[PDB]
Amino acid sequence: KTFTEVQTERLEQADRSVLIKCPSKLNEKKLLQYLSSHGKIDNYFFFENRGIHALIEFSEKSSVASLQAVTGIPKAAEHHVVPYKSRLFTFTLKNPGSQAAEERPVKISPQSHIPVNELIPKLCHADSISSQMYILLNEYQLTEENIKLRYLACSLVRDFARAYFPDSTVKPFGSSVNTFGKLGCDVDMFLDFHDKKGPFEMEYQMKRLPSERLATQKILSIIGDCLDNFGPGYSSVQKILNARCPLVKFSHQPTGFQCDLSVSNSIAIRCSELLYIYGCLDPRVRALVFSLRCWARVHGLTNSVPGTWITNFSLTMMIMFFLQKRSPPIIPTLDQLKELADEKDKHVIGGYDCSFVSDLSKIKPTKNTETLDELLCDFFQYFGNFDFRKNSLNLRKGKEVNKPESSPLYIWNPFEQDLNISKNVNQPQLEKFVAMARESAWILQKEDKTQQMINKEPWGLAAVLIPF
Amino acid sequence: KTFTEVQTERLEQADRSVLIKCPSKLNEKKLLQYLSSHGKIDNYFFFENRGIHALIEFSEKSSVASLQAVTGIPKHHVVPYKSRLFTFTLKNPGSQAEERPVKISPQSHIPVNELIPKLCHADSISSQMYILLNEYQLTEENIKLRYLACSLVRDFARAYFPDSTVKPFGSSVNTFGKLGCDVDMFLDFHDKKGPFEMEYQMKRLPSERLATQKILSIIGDCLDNFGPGYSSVQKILNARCPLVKFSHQPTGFQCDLSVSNSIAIRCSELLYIYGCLDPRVRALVFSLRCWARVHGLTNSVPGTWITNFSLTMMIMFFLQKRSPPIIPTLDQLKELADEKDKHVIGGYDCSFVSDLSKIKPTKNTETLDELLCDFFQYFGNFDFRKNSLNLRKGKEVNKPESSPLYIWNPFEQDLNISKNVNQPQLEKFVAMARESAWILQKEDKTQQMINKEPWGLAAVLIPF
Numbered sequence: 001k002t003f004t005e006v007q008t009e010r011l012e013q014a015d016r017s018v019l020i021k022c023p024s025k026l027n028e029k030k031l032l033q034y035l036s037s038h039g040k041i042d043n044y045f046f047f048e049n050r051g052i053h054a055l056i057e058f059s060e061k062s063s064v065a066s067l068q069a070v071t072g073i074p075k076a077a078e079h080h081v082v083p084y085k086s087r088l089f090t091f092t093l094k095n096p097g098s099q100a101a102e103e104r105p106v107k108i109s110p111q112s113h114i115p116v117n118e119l120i121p122k123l124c125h126a127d128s129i130s131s132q133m134y135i136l137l138n139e140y141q142l143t144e145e146n147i148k149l150r151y152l153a154c155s156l157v158r159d160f161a162r163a164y165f166p167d168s169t170v171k172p173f174g175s176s177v178n179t180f181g182k183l184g185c186d187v188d189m190f191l192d193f194h195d196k197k198g199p200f201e202m203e204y205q206m207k208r209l210p211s212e213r214l215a216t217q218k219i220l221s222i223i224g225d226c227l228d229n230f231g232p233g234y235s236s237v238q239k240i241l242n243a244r245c246p247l248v249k250f251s252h253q254p255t256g257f258q259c260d261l262s263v264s265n266s267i268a269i270r271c272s273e274l275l276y277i278y279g280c281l282d283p284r285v286r287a288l289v290f291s292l293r294c295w296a297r298v299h300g301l302t303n304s305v306p307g308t309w310i311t312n313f314s315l316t317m318m319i320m321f322f323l324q325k326r327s328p329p330i331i332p333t334l335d336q337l338k339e340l341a342d343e344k345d346k347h348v349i350g351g352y353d354c355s356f357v358s359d360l361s362k363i364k365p366t367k368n369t370e371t372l373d374e375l376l377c378d379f380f381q382y383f384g385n386f387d388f389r390k391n392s393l394n395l396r397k398g399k400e401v402n403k404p405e406s407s408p409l410y411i412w413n414p415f416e417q418d419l420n421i422s423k424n425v426n427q428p429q430l431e432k433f434v435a436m437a438r439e440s441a442w443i444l445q446k447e448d449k450t451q452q453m454i455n456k457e458p459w460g461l462a463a464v465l466i467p468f
Numbered sequence: 469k470t471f472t473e474v475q476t477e478r479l480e481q482a483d484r485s486v487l488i489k490c491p492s493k494l495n496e497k498k499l500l501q502y503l504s505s506h507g508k509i510d511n512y513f514f515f516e517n518r519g520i521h522a523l524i525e526f527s528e529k530s531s532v533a534s535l536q537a538v539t540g541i542p543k544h545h546v547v548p549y550k551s552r553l554f555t556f557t558l559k560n561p562g563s564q565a566e567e568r569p570v571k572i573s574p575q576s577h578i579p580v581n582e583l584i585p586k587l588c589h590a591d592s593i594s595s596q597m598y599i600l601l602n603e604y605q606l607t608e609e610n611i612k613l614r615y616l617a618c619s620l621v622r623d624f625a626r627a628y629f630p631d632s633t634v635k636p637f638g639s640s641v642n643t644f645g646k647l648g649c650d651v652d653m654f655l656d657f658h659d660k661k662g663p664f665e666m667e668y669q670m671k672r673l674p675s676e677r678l679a680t681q682k683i684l685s686i687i688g689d690c691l692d693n694f695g696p697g698y699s700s701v702q703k704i705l706n707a708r709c710p711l712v713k714f715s716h717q718p719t720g721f722q723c724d725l726s727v728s729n730s731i732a733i734r735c736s737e738l739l740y741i742y743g744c745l746d747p748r749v750r751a752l753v754f755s756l757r758c759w760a761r762v763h764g765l766t767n768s769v770p771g772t773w774i775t776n777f778s779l780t781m782m783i784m785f786f787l788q789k790r791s792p793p794i795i796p797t798l799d800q801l802k803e804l805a806d807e808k809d810k811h812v813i814g815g816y817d818c819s820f821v822s823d824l825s826k827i828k829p830t831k832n833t834e835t836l837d838e839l840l841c842d843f844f845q846y847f848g849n850f851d852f853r854k855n856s857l858n859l860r861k862g863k864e865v866n867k868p869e870s871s872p873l874y875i876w877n878p879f880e881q882d883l884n885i886s887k888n889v890n891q892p893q894l895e896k897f898v899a900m901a902r903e904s905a906w907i908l909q910k911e912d913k914t915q916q917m918i919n920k921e922p923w924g925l926a927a928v929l930i931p932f
């Protein structure tokens with residue numbers, strides 16, 4: 001199960017999946033027994049989002065065609081609609097009178113996490129700090145159902161682009177696939193659209209595309225407008241084509257996701273695969289990232305809108321660096337992963353060698369056994385006393401090194417020669433992070449966990465996940 | 469055959485047709501013998517438009533697939549939309565010449581100044597009008613090219629809208645088209661045991677109009693940026709009938725794309741019938757169109773000018789009023805209809821016969837000589853301030869409203885098709901018609917021929 005194998009398997013599954021707006025009065029078996037007539041169904045689930053929807057995953061892609069064959073355009077408004085046919089259906093009854101089977105309630109797969117205030121109680125009633133972080137992890141991480149929904153969303157966007165770029169794919173990256181995603185996070189999408197004889201050389205006549213950026217802007221502008229007007233479920237479609245990386249933001253109502261669509265950047269795909277590996281190598285890695293993300297949000301260190309704030313990605317890279325520096329390391333360095341690679345795993349982008357192992361079995365398991373109790377406090381202790389003015393984080397080496405340039409917080413981009421991934425960060429925001437980390441370390445170091453439990457007060461992870 | 473039967477036959481032929489940009493050095497037999505390997509070829513011809521192109525029409529649609537199978541994408545590259553526009557180059561350009569010249573089917577008419585000589589050398593006026601008709605009317609080749617253009621836009625629209633069809637209307641199919649006229653295209657939308665009624669989830673836009681505007685806006689942009697051969701794409705979505713204008717470079721056609729309007733399809737079929745009923749009808753329209761252009765009565769850009777369509781409707785009215793009529797009234801055609809020909813649109817009954825055989829042939833035998841002069845005589849002395857043209861009744865009637873020139877729209881309750889026309893332009897038309905009548909009535913045709921001067925139709929197709 002390499003990252004790339006998973007992507008391909010997840011996309012092929014989304015390829016043969018549909019969404020169905022269910023009627024208020026729903027008989028599960030009737031619906032499935034009926035749908036089974038178009039072909040076998042591998043998976044399905046239901047979820048709540050302005051009424052009940054169902055994701056159905058067929059075994060054959062031919063089943064989707066078969067279902068579409070018997071699907072019609074709304075009769076009452078056959079002239080007041082844009083007749084774009086997708087895989088978003090609505091299932092009403094021929095004879096509403098002839099409902100003829102018992103009505104069971106249906107199971108709702110949740111697509112959002114419980115809010116922070118509900119979580120704090122669950123954390124206090126835990127036993128140790130280690131358990132607290134696993135509760136939080138369990139409460140926040142992506143479920144199987146949610147993952148399928150994210151891949152489906154990509155597949156629906158792909159179908160628009162394939163109109164004129166048949167070979168195109170739309171693939172998710174970032175949180176949605178790097179194992180560090182939490183429920184409610186955006187779906188980041190990459191559009192990837194570049195993928196006998198005779199006495200004549202016969203060629204199709206085809207319109208030539210502009211220069212990369214200009215092509216990107218036009219392709220995304222048109223896809224943006226299609227989502228807007230061919231819909232049906234897309235709203236709040238914001239074009240941000242003048243950004244460094246041209247972008248389209250939108251909301252997808254059937255699934256409920258906030259989505260960001262841009263043209264493929266092969267570097268960002270490697271970062272996502274890298275984090276996947278680190279995520280898959282040890283469960284403490286994930287448990288630690290989820291807790292420290294939440295911590296950063298709680299104290300206002302991270303924001304949703306860009307600026308001088310530390311970004312979740314940068315913060316995630318610090319956590320990886322920190323884990324590279326343990327005795328013994330919990331995860332390997334990127335150079336260690338490069339040297340475990342072969343010719344099959346060779347990727348070279350923009351000159352620089354972005355190669356590393358894809359098979360996890362070839363990585364030797366860590367000997368480290370530090371508990372999350374120690375690791376959380378040490379994270380705060382470590383970066384609370386890290387000399388940021390003099391040192392930078394190199395994830396290739398796994399070492400503190402001299403800064404290539406005067407910048408408050410320098411984190412070496414592992415896939416681009418001299419690039420600081422946290423270049424946005426100013427001195428004030430860095431100092432506020434350091435102060436928060438120091439306070440967090442102090443609280444954990446000098447608290448009575450038993451006496452706080454007895455008093456029904458916050459303790460451990462819960463004590464650091466509330467304002468100071 | 470009926471107008472609808474023809475459309476279907478013409479579209480099916482376009483369905484299994486391709487365009488090929490030929491190489492400069494062209495061997496006809498090699499190309500066809502090769503292409504024949506993919507299947508039998510019913511028709512083909514060549515034409516000039518920034519180099520030589522060829523329309524090839526296969527007998528089987530499978531031949532197009534077979535040809536596409538052996539076709540490649542050209543070696544910031546290209547939008548990989550595969551259509552039926554090909555480029556055949558030579559593998560080895562050097563070891564060729566191969567050099568035998570090819571026949572070019574013309575896609576534009578000879579200009580007015582070249583035509584005047586041909587008209588003077590004719591015998592009668594009747595022949596003049598048939599020369600002009602022959603020189604200007606659409607050829608078979610051109611028709612096929614127009615239907616092909618629609619078929620490609622259909623293929624382009626079917627990317628997002630699989631069920632779509634695109635069909636030409638107006639000049640291109642009503643029999644009154646002349647070479648070089650635009651291709652008007654209509655985009656149309658036409659295509660168990662289970663207990664559920666299953667329907668697509670789609671946004672309900674308030675009006676047909678808003679849907680139309682959005683569909684055409686997106687298709688317009690696609691043609692602009694992804695469409696092969698399409699350029700000069702103008703969006704005119706705020707017009708009465710939302711519209712996208714564009715130029716198609718392989719064929720050379722100026723095209724106008726809009727959403728199907730069932731009224732405009734009926735007008736096209738109506739004019740088809742009148743065109744098919746008698747050759748004098750066409751001969752008369754083509755000459756009077758050209759006459760109107762020559763004296764600046766019609767313009768390409770809209771305004772207060774009389775439009776070719778309005779002018780065509782006057783000519784139809786005039787022919788309804790002959791003794792005996794050359795063509796029937798629309799009410800006569802309605803009453804020859806049956807349940808099969810029943811069309812009711814927007815409340816109003818737009819029904820009429822589609823089978824031409826059920827119309828009794830005209831007994832009229834007036835020559836074009838008489839008919840041309842009479843047209844000018846009739847409308848030269850028509851009282852436009854008091855009367856209006858009703859093509860349903862075939863009668864002069866009182867005007868529903870104060871408008872210089874009122875021509876009743878035959879398919880819509882109180883609508884004047886020539887409402888744009890002001891008093892000055894109407895008066896200039898009347899004056900020109902009167903002068904034209906005077907010239908034809910009081911000229912010596914023999915003495916003008918002897919003197920090598922303009923006479924008859926030629927005398928009225930030059931400025932006064």
Ligand SMILES: O=c1ccn([C@@H]2O[C@H](COP(=O)(O)OP(=O)(O)OP(=O)(O)O)[C@@H](O)[C@H]2O)c(=O)[nH]1
Nearest residue numbers: 174175176185186188268271272311312313421
């Ligand atoms: O400086 C950067 C920032 C971001 N990226 C790449 O762009 C991706 C998108 O940036 P995000 O910050 O959205 O990543 P994310 O989805 O993992 O985090 P959250 O939304 O949960 O906050 C990141 O996952 C990273 O791979 C860079 O390569 N360099």
Ligand SMILES: O=c1ccn([C@@H]2O[C@H](COP(=O)(O)OP(=O)(O)OP(=O)(O)O)[C@@H](O)[C@H]2O)c(=O)[nH]1
Nearest residue numbers: 637638639649652731732733735736776777885
């Ligand atoms: O008042 C009008 C005007 C136009 N129409 C409808 O719009 C169609 C296209 O409008 P055009 O005026 O372009 O007709 P055309 O293409 O046959 O004429 P040329 O461009 O060759 O001069 C016409 O064929 C008619 O059916 C109306 O129904 N009513």
Ligand SMILES: [Mg+2]
Nearest residue numbers: 174186187188
């Ligand atoms: Mg994001």
Ligand SMILES: [Mg+2]
Nearest residue numbers: 638639649650
């Ligand atoms: Mg036209």
